Enzyme design. Structure first.
Site, PDB file in Angstrom:
ATOM      1  CB  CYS A  13      -1.174   0.567   1.584  1.00  0.00           C
ATOM      2  SG  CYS A  13      -2.146  -1.306   1.152  1.00  0.00           S
ATOM      3  CG  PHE A  14       2.732   2.485   2.698  1.00  0.00           C
ATOM      4  CD1 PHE A  14       1.451   3.493   3.467  1.00  0.00           C
ATOM      5  CD2 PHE A  14       2.418   1.501   3.894  1.00  0.00           C
ATOM      6  CE2 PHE A  14       1.067   0.957   4.650  1.00  0.00           C
TER       7      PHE A  14
END
Length: 473
Positions: A447-448
């Site tokens: 997600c990052f």
């Protein structure tokens, strides 16, 4: 209930209500609001850069045997057999012991892919089928045409005719793979900002024909695989794990629902009794305004979560989050896929291999990548970052792609390159952060787009640990 400008209610022959937008001729089963109108309008993002998508094709310029075994050939033409079950090789045919410096065992994506292509080729039917689609009505026309055909007809040659007008097959697959995501049909939604993390929409039930559409979409993805064509839909890796009937894990959860994963992780790693947490083995779901409570196990809504049982709570919450509200849709998809390409043909691919098979892989711009990588508690002159980029340069594009999938969770790269790299909460460049000690293994938060790289003591240790982490699972 009032409707945004242009929209009107309609009722069909079975007294079912639907909606039509007189300005753009879209129709939908779900009552439009201005939120859904703006959502649709942004999604109409030319749905161009099909030529850049087509580079994937040029880029791909490279008695039964018991399950899990392969025939392979050495560079000098010597036959050997690979036992994926035991991760060994032998020169002895396991069917009859006939023998042709033992060959190192290796995953060998390209070998498995070639056997699968032969499998599809071996089961092609002859002649062709013609699909007649109006380009402005591409989803409804492709749906009607494909679903009218017996699944075996989908294994003939495909001749696509865009109404009023080989490469038409690639264009059909590319365009339609975007077209099925149209929010007016209600089949899908995103978990993150912009178009981050596709998933099936629990509210697809508002479309009374949603299971026919999911069946069609499974047939379509299977058809891309069978005919060797690439799609651009952007399924998540946990979705592909589900197609492979693989177990979905708490780490999988991190990829698709950050907050849900974070709560589960806090419950696992904290004393929930000393801080007064009050939770039970049931969960609520809201689909189309209607709230539904679900017991995680028998009588679950009455069972307090405690230190003693919270591990069980965590596993049941993970499983539930992966399957909640989408069981029937997912089955329809799997069924449609399976009647074109037997899911068993995929048994010894992993989820990342499957994604590259469907999406195709590109050559990675090492310079663009390195120009748009950011660092936490490292600098570009840290020894481990220098070793990182030496390792990336020193390896081939298969490993680079597999590392890309490890960190960002996908093999699809943005149209604008690594500067336009996207995460769940918006723009989010590839990032390498210093964590832990040299005895850890690398870890990733997709997600990052973030790689946790322990501060290893030598280049060779960084190479070994990195290769192990990107090969895993």
């Amino acid at each position: 209930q009032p409707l945004p400008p242009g929209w009107e209610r309609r009722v069909d022959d079975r007294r079912r209500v639907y909606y039509v937008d007189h300005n753009t001729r879209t129709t939908t089963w779900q009552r439009p609001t201005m939120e859904s109108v703006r959502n649709f309008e942004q999604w109409q993002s030319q749905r161009g850069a099909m030529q850049q998508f087509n580079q994937r094709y040029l880029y791909s310029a490279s008695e039964p045997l018991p399950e899990g075994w392969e025939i392979r050939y050495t560079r000098e033409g010597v036959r050997y057999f690979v036992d994926h079950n035991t991760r060994t090789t032998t020169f002895k045919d396991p069917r009859n012991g006939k023998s042709s410096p033992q060959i190192a065992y290796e995953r060998g994506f390209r070998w498995k892919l070639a056997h699968f292509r032969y499998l599809c080729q071996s089961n092609a039917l002859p002649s062709h089928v013609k699909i007649n689609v109006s380009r402005q009505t591409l989803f409804e026309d492709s749906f009607q045409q494909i679903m009218a055909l017996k699944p075996y007809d989908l294994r003939r040659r495909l001749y696509v005719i865009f109404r009023g007008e080989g490469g038409l097959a690639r264009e059909w697959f590319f365009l339609l793979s975007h077209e099925v995501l149209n929010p007016m049909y209600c089949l899908f939604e995103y978990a993150g900002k912009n178009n981050y993390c596709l998933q099936i929409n629990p509210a697809s039930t508002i479309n009374p024909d949603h299971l026919s559409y999911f069946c069609f979409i499974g047939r379509f993805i299977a058809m891309a695989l069978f005919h060797g064509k690439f799609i651009d839909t952007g399924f998540s890796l946990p979705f592909y794990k589900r197609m492979l009937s693989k177990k979905l894990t708490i780490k999988d959860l991190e990829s698709i629902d950050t907050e849900f994963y974070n709560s589960l992780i806090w419950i696992r790693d904290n004393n929930i009794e000393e801080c007064g947490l009050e939770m039970y083995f049931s969960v609520d779901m809201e689909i189309l305004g209607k709230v539904t409570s679900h017991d995680l196990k028998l009588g679950g809504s009455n069972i307090l979560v405690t230190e003693e049982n919270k591990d069980e709570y965590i596993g049941l919450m993970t499983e539930w989050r992966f399957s909640r509200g989408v069981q029937e849709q997912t089955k329809a998809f799997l069924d449609g896929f399976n009647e074109v390409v037997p899911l068993q043909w995929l048994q010894y691919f992993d989820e990342k291999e499957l994604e590259v098979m469907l999406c195709g892989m590109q050559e990675v711009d090492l310079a663009d990548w390195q120009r748009n990588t950011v660092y936490r508690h490292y600098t570009r002159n840290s020894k481990q970052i220098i070793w990182f980029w030496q390792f990336v340069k020193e390896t081939d594009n298969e490993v680079r792609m597999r590392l890309l999938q490890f960190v960002t969770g996908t093999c699809r790269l943005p149209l604008g390159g690594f500067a336009e790299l996207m995460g769940s909460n918006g723009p989010q460049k590839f990032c390498i952060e210093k964590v832990g000690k040299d005895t850890w293994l690398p870890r990733s938060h997709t997600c990052f787009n973030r790689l946790d790289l322990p501060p290893y003591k030598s280049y060779e240790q960084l190479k070994e640990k990195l290769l192990f982490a990107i090969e895993e699972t």
